[PDB]
Design a protein around this motif. Structure first.
Motif, PDB file in Angstrom:
ATOM      1  N   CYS A 293       3.918   4.122  11.592  1.00  0.00           N
ATOM      2  CA  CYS A 293       4.768   3.055  12.101  1.00  0.00           C
ATOM      3  C   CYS A 293       3.927   1.931  12.701  1.00  0.00           C
ATOM      4  O   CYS A 293       4.288   0.755  12.599  1.00  0.00           O
ATOM      5  CB  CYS A 293       5.743   3.621  13.141  1.00  0.00           C
ATOM      6  SG  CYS A 293       7.076   2.484  13.619  1.00  0.00           S
ATOM      7  N   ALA A 294       2.770   2.269  13.276  1.00  0.00           N
ATOM      8  CA  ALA A 294       1.930   1.253  13.898  1.00  0.00           C
ATOM      9  C   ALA A 294       1.322   0.295  12.883  1.00  0.00           C
ATOM     10  O   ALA A 294       1.156  -0.889  13.191  1.00  0.00           O
ATOM     11  CB  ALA A 294       0.822   1.921  14.709  1.00  0.00           C
ATOM     12  N   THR A 295       0.998   0.766  11.671  1.00  0.00           N
ATOM     13  CA  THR A 295       0.074   0.038  10.796  1.00  0.00           C
ATOM     14  C   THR A 295       0.659  -0.421   9.471  1.00  0.00           C
ATOM     15  O   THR A 295      -0.023  -1.163   8.744  1.00  0.00           O
ATOM     16  CB  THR A 295      -1.174   0.884  10.498  1.00  0.00           C
ATOM     17  OG1 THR A 295      -0.791   2.133   9.902  1.00  0.00           O
ATOM     18  CG2 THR A 295      -1.964   1.150  11.773  1.00  0.00           C
ATOM     19  N   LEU A 296       1.867   0.018   9.118  1.00  0.00           N
ATOM     20  CA  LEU A 296       2.605  -0.543   7.999  1.00  0.00           C
ATOM     21  C   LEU A 296       3.034  -1.975   8.296  1.00  0.00           C
ATOM     22  O   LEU A 296       3.173  -2.371   9.452  1.00  0.00           O
ATOM     23  CB  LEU A 296       3.837   0.314   7.710  1.00  0.00           C
ATOM     24  CG  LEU A 296       3.461   1.724   7.252  1.00  0.00           C
ATOM     25  CD1 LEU A 296       4.677   2.628   7.236  1.00  0.00           C
ATOM     26  CD2 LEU A 296       2.866   1.620   5.897  1.00  0.00           C
ATOM     27  N   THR A 297       3.215  -2.764   7.240  1.00  0.00           N
ATOM     28  CA  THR A 297       3.825  -4.080   7.376  1.00  0.00           C
ATOM     29  C   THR A 297       5.350  -3.955   7.286  1.00  0.00           C
ATOM     30  O   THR A 297       5.889  -2.919   6.898  1.00  0.00           O
ATOM     31  CB  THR A 297       3.306  -5.039   6.307  1.00  0.00           C
ATOM     32  OG1 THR A 297       3.806  -4.629   5.033  1.00  0.00           O
ATOM     33  CG2 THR A 297       1.785  -5.037   6.268  1.00  0.00           C
TER      34      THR A 297
ATOM     35  N   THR B 103       0.793  -1.217   0.000  1.00  0.00           N
ATOM     36  CA  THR B 103       0.000   0.000   0.000  1.00  0.00           C
ATOM     37  C   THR B 103       0.827   1.269   0.000  1.00  0.00           C
ATOM     38  O   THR B 103       0.252   2.342   0.174  1.00  0.00           O
ATOM     39  CB  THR B 103      -0.931   0.035   1.212  1.00  0.00           C
ATOM     40  OG1 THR B 103      -0.153   0.145   2.416  1.00  0.00           O
ATOM     41  CG2 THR B 103      -1.782  -1.218   1.264  1.00  0.00           C
TER      42      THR B 103
ATOM     43  N   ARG C 251      -4.076   3.132   6.710  1.00  0.00           N
ATOM     44  CA  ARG C 251      -4.061   1.692   6.891  1.00  0.00           C
ATOM     45  C   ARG C 251      -4.820   1.301   8.156  1.00  0.00           C
ATOM     46  O   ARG C 251      -4.849   2.062   9.127  1.00  0.00           O
ATOM     47  CB  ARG C 251      -2.619   1.184   6.971  1.00  0.00           C
ATOM     48  CG  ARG C 251      -1.865   1.216   5.645  1.00  0.00           C
ATOM     49  CD  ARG C 251      -0.896   2.388   5.571  1.00  0.00           C
ATOM     50  NE  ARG C 251      -0.166   2.455   4.307  1.00  0.00           N
ATOM     51  CZ  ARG C 251       0.637   3.455   3.956  1.00  0.00           C
ATOM     52  NH1 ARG C 251       0.857   4.488   4.762  1.00  0.00           N
ATOM     53  NH2 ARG C 251       1.239   3.419   2.770  1.00  0.00           N
ATOM     54  N   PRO C 252      -5.426   0.110   8.176  1.00  0.00           N
ATOM     55  CA  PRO C 252      -6.337  -0.255   9.271  1.00  0.00           C
ATOM     56  C   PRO C 252      -5.574  -0.573  10.542  1.00  0.00           C
ATOM     57  O   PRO C 252      -4.502  -1.198  10.499  1.00  0.00           O
ATOM     58  CB  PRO C 252      -7.056  -1.504   8.740  1.00  0.00           C
ATOM     59  CG  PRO C 252      -6.103  -2.084   7.752  1.00  0.00           C
ATOM     60  CD  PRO C 252      -5.360  -0.933   7.135  1.00  0.00           C
TER      61      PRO C 252
ATOM     62  N   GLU D  36       6.492  -3.368   3.759  1.00  0.00           N
ATOM     63  CA  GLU D  36       6.192  -1.986   3.404  1.00  0.00           C
ATOM     64  C   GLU D  36       7.224  -1.028   3.993  1.00  0.00           C
ATOM     65  O   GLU D  36       7.682  -0.103   3.310  1.00  0.00           O
ATOM     66  CB  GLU D  36       4.783  -1.621   3.867  1.00  0.00           C
ATOM     67  CG  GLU D  36       3.695  -1.935   2.854  1.00  0.00           C
ATOM     68  CD  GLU D  36       2.309  -1.925   3.465  1.00  0.00           C
ATOM     69  OE1 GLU D  36       2.214  -1.787   4.710  1.00  0.00           O
ATOM     70  OE2 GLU D  36       1.311  -2.061   2.707  1.00  0.00           O
TER      71      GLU D  36
ATOM     72  N   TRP E 202      -1.399   1.706  19.997  1.00  0.00           N
ATOM     73  CA  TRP E 202      -0.533   2.866  19.793  1.00  0.00           C
ATOM     74  C   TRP E 202      -1.374   4.135  19.696  1.00  0.00           C
ATOM     75  O   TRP E 202      -1.084   5.142  20.347  1.00  0.00           O
ATOM     76  CB  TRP E 202       0.338   2.677  18.542  1.00  0.00           C
ATOM     77  CG  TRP E 202       1.292   3.843  18.172  1.00  0.00           C
ATOM     78  CD1 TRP E 202       1.050   5.189  18.281  1.00  0.00           C
ATOM     79  CD2 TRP E 202       2.615   3.729  17.614  1.00  0.00           C
ATOM     80  NE1 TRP E 202       2.137   5.907  17.836  1.00  0.00           N
ATOM     81  CE2 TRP E 202       3.101   5.037  17.411  1.00  0.00           C
ATOM     82  CE3 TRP E 202       3.427   2.645  17.255  1.00  0.00           C
ATOM     83  CZ2 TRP E 202       4.369   5.292  16.876  1.00  0.00           C
ATOM     84  CZ3 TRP E 202       4.674   2.896  16.719  1.00  0.00           C
ATOM     85  CH2 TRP E 202       5.138   4.208  16.540  1.00  0.00           C
TER      86      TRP E 202
ATOM     87  N   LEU F 247      -0.223  -4.378  16.765  1.00  0.00           N
ATOM     88  CA  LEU F 247      -0.356  -2.940  16.557  1.00  0.00           C
ATOM     89  C   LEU F 247      -1.265  -2.569  15.388  1.00  0.00           C
ATOM     90  O   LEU F 247      -1.617  -1.386  15.255  1.00  0.00           O
ATOM     91  CB  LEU F 247       1.027  -2.318  16.348  1.00  0.00           C
ATOM     92  CG  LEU F 247       1.800  -2.260  17.675  1.00  0.00           C
ATOM     93  CD1 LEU F 247       3.299  -1.995  17.504  1.00  0.00           C
ATOM     94  CD2 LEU F 247       1.170  -1.254  18.633  1.00  0.00           C
ATOM     95  N   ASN F 248      -1.661  -3.523  14.545  1.00  0.00           N
ATOM     96  CA  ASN F 248      -2.549  -3.201  13.430  1.00  0.00           C
ATOM     97  C   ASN F 248      -3.344  -4.432  13.008  1.00  0.00           C
ATOM     98  O   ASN F 248      -3.065  -5.558  13.420  1.00  0.00           O
ATOM     99  CB  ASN F 248      -1.774  -2.615  12.244  1.00  0.00           C
ATOM    100  CG  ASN F 248      -0.841  -3.618  11.612  1.00  0.00           C
ATOM    101  OD1 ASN F 248      -1.274  -4.536  10.914  1.00  0.00           O
ATOM    102  ND2 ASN F 248       0.453  -3.469  11.880  1.00  0.00           N
ATOM    103  N   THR F 249      -4.336  -4.195  12.151  1.00  0.00           N
ATOM    104  CA  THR F 249      -5.294  -5.237  11.786  1.00  0.00           C
ATOM    105  C   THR F 249      -4.671  -6.284  10.884  1.00  0.00           C
ATOM    106  O   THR F 249      -5.037  -7.461  10.954  1.00  0.00           O
ATOM    107  CB  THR F 249      -6.505  -4.609  11.102  1.00  0.00           C
ATOM    108  OG1 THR F 249      -6.953  -3.501  11.885  1.00  0.00           O
ATOM    109  CG2 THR F 249      -7.661  -5.625  10.963  1.00  0.00           C
ATOM    110  N   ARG F 250      -3.743  -5.884  10.026  1.00  0.00           N
ATOM    111  CA  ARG F 250      -3.126  -6.863   9.144  1.00  0.00           C
ATOM    112  C   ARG F 250      -2.228  -7.808   9.929  1.00  0.00           C
ATOM    113  O   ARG F 250      -2.251  -9.023   9.699  1.00  0.00           O
ATOM    114  CB  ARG F 250      -2.377  -6.148   8.019  1.00  0.00           C
ATOM    115  CG  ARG F 250      -3.345  -5.489   7.013  1.00  0.00           C
ATOM    116  CD  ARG F 250      -2.632  -4.821   5.857  1.00  0.00           C
ATOM    117  NE  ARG F 250      -1.887  -3.625   6.242  1.00  0.00           N
ATOM    118  CZ  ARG F 250      -0.978  -3.044   5.475  1.00  0.00           C
ATOM    119  NH1 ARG F 250      -0.700  -3.503   4.264  1.00  0.00           N
ATOM    120  NH2 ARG F 250      -0.323  -1.982   5.934  1.00  0.00           N
TER     121      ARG F 250
END
Ligand code: KRN
Ligand code: KRN
Ligand code: KRN
Ligand code: KRN
Lengths: 324, 324, 322, 322
Positions: free
Chosen positions: A62-66, A32, A294-295, A69, B121, B94-97
């Protein structure tokens, strides 16, 4: 590549977002990051005269990236910068081993430091937080560390004796700092750290201690960096001439432009929507394309979104006003 | 393997720790799970009559284990259980993924569900939290989900309309629930969820609604599970006979045993040291070996440690008292 | 003879301090509608209430003048005629003022004072314990009902506090909020009748039917038939073991309260505790609470609407259960 | 003629309400040491203070009786002899009481009231604005100093509040805490002299040397030579552009305060604000603050030690700067 110190940290340090593709709010999507916009932003910030780039804090996602990514994003940033300005990545995570593993990898790619809060599943106390940053700097001693002193995100409130302890760690060279009520004392307790106030607080902070306060962080610059460049140049002219009139006018302009950013003026309410509000402000200003969140953090109340877009329009206008 | 519902959730549900090797507080160590003790604990809990096992919450160190450690731990738990009792892993992240990726992998290994808080976070609001759990249950519809409703760890406070929304999600079958001030209303708003009070609140909660309140969660059982088994058997005898005298005596014993657990009685102060206090209590009781805390959460004030060890000694004695 | 916990049973209703139509004006001087006071008391007793509390937060203990308080209690004392127990309220900013107020109002004929703690400076545990021991020792003929509201009084009334109050004969009861620690608190404080909120009485009675025999109600100011029915039905449930009708009444009461708290938030409700309760009561039409004395006469309209909807729901319930 | 912000300059010192040795006893009735009051005022003026504030939190506005307040102000009013401005304090639990107190104490000869807000019920912004407009309109000859303490008064005194107070002629100044938003607040409130805490005056003066010309001090009750030297040195720094000696004085003041706050925590300090300040003052030996009136006479010993160490540090500083 010789490691950064506080003496190398001056001027406008701008925090950029992690541009996202049009389907980035969908958990099913996997790549993404818009690397073209990522690169384009880096070129235009450096061309505008920014002294350094921070990234991968709260609104940098930073929390929601893979992890893949983050590596592609950092790689693209590093190439595009070509060593023209210092760059900090971000590697806050839920534990010390994951922080270390990320920091090692992203320093190897070419970032010069990490903007680093503390693990926050369990609220950290003062000795826990000191030892955390000690462990990290000992494990990757070639990394410069910027403390991301956000008590809303990270629970821990980064008190005065914490800053006295960080000044003892050579790797800790700067800090993304919030309210300046205790900046006078924190400068005394922490001689070796370049404290970055928020751009709107830079005027007052530099008046408090013009020797120590030579740099600031900016997210408003993602709406048009001319205002931050103008403020930097005018404050340093003010320190020499003693005429702060023009510096106060810019700073007052920046404050007014932020007057609708926080829902009800409330930093804690803003903090629930930190990512979405910053990105929507940036989307609204049209200087770059931040894109969807991002989710799970892709839901912002429309009233709150309007406040952010108004701020974004206010900063785009300030950019025009302070350009050329 | 047909998916769990709330009807399958009764009795003593015991939360086990993730046993650690003697060097687990060191960030340099990489395989810090004692799989032999992990297996041994599973055998002794099932032999003691526990109805189900939860794991990988706060004190189970979901925050501080590595991914390879979590896979080896879950694998060992799954083998040793051999389908004799339901098992929930934990996959808060920290995220949904990342939550989805972990949940998929650990369900495939053989866990029956996930004990799941929310990313923390950025503090989540109510629609953000509902959609998070919806996304996860839609992405892994074969996973049962236990809500880990911890507002200290996860910031979000899991209010009444949240529970009304979770009752609409078939995957959400149970909840690790804290104070019962609003349990009466939450049962009405959420007919399809088996609410697990804390073991010390099970007595009162079951008196409120003996039809709905048939199960509870226990960490005291890691000091000797006889007390939790005795309470389960006596409450259900009490529901039939109407004589709650013996059930109140056990429950009062459990409350007194916890009287030194929280520093100053303060759940928020306890929450800063959740991992260390639970593990030290368990270390002190001698029924299993929890071991050192993975970093950064390996520093507990000695006064606080003493309170936990006293509690651990109090529960070991309760186990002896309610054994055979 | 002074009250003990054994005297505290059934429905205990909290009375507003009814206000004349100029009561928001800081220039006003005598803003109690003493004829509405007298008439509420008559109607409350006729309806079968067990006792009357008053002068807490929404009772405007903070915003009444002293002479207004003197005249209010006298009116209540003489309308009651000794038919039920009556607690006044004398929370103030220091011990000496609390004592001086408690003396005069007990002398007028109150049976006890519903009392929180001075809250300019937040008290810790020993400060609060000594405060209550000071008052009890200074007016020993006065019963005390702990008004345990951490939002108003800052101090959170923790478990060791309840153990200490059980050591004081004068502390007979407690206006109590969330019931998450009630089981423990009943164990630590054997000599105190704990009054849950009316919506929480169903669950609390089921936890400990021997100890939980009474509750406090402000919805009864919207029409006390619902609270009276819940008392009688819970008493029957404790004997039959059949709680269906008690749960039906209790679930109705929660529903009627579901728009009272702005955003469901107790702390946001506490900012407009006076205005929202009196605006709810005014809309129910059982009594005329009247304007709020300064400074708490400003309430957002969305919040006011929520309380009026609740007043209408409770007034509907009163008809349902007459 | 009534004060304006242009009259508010230099060191403004906050006076305790000195107490007779029986002042902790709730049976006591006249606990002000009027001879120590008079003597502090004489010594404060001789030392060169610019104005005297009083009757805030540690001044025990909450725990003094009315007659004790009347006699205290009279003693101060007549010892001052019009040599400096004087603010009393009249924060109470409602507008009508605040007004009735402000009238009498202004009539006795106070120039203004240092005023927070009623805090039984936490006010929002419109409630607080109207409260201050109510008092200002009711006693227009009284100046007002906003006592902006969110720990005591719950309400947090946000940016739009300061814009409103600039609309009120009577509000001439503000006893101000953390300076993180001072730059913005000075812009929103052009007609208010903002008084930072003495330790924060150095930084605030540097931010806006035109507006920041005054500060409030409680350490001056330990010996006012340090505060007087900081005023004179900062005034010279604004002209020479040499702030080294002002920063030296300021850094000394922070060091002397470094054991005042239990655990460095403002909210834990606020629980014992009265006791810790008066215990600090008693240990400095410049004046005799005396016992704390009930209920706030209990302070943990570790905390008491911290305040006594601070009293000794400030008293040392007073010698250093005499
Ligand atoms: C850092 C910036 C945020 O912490 C912040 C703080 C205060 C005002 C605005 C913003 O965005 C980050 O998100 O990386
Ligand atoms: C869950 C249990 C904790 O949330 C908790 C809550 C209340 C009392 C004691 C404990 O451990 C977990 O850590 O997985
Ligand atoms: C006591 C009642 C208030 O504290 C309260 C608490 C919860 C819901 C509603 C109300 O009024 C009093 O006002 O005296
Ligand atoms: C005002 C001063 C207190 O609010 C305060 C604030 C910060 C540090 C020390 C003190 O005393 C008053 O007590 O009237």
């Amino acid at each position: 590549t010789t490691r950064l110190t506080a003496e190398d940290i001056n001027g406008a340090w701008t925090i950029m977002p992690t541009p996202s593709t049009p389907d980035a709010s969908d958990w099913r999507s996997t790549n993404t990051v818009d690397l073209d916009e990522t690169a384009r932003i880096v070129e235009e910030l450096i061309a505008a005269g920014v002294n350094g780039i921070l990234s991968m804090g709260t609104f940098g996602e930073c929390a929601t990236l893979t992890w893949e990514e983050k590596r592609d994003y950092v790689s693209t940033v590093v190439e595009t910068i070509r060593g023209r300005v210092p760059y900090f990545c971000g590697t806050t995570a839920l534990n010390t081993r994951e922080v270390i593993r990320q920091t090692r990898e992203l320093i190897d790619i070419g970032a010069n430091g990490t903007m680093l809060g503390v693990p926050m599943w369990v609220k950290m106390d003062l000795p826990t937080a000191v030892q955390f940053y000690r462990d990290v700097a000992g494990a990757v001693p070639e990394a410069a560390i910027a403390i991301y002193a956000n008590p809303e995100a990270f629970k821990f409130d980064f008190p005065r004796p914490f800053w006295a302890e960080m000044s003892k760690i050579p790797q800790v060279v700067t800090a993304k700092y919030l309210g300046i009520g205790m900046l006078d004392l924190d400068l005394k307790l922490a001689p070796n750290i370049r404290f970055l106030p928020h751009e709107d607080d830079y005027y007052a902070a530099a008046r408090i201690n013009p020797e120590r306060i030579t740099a600031f962080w900016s997210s408003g610059a993602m709406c048009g960096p001319a205002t931050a460049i103008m403020l930097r140049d005018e404050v340093e002219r003010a320190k020499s001439t003693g005429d702060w009139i023009k510096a106060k006018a810019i700073s007052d302009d920046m404050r007014a432009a932020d007057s609708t950013l926080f829902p009800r003026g409330d930093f804690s309410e803003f903090s629930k929507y930190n990512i979405g509000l910053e990105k929507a402000r940036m989307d609204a200003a049209g200087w770059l394309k931040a894109g969807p969140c991002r989710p799970p953090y892709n839901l912002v109340p429309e009233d709150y979104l309007v406040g952010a877009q108004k701020s974004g329009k206010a900063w785009a206008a300030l950019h025009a006003k302070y350009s050329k």
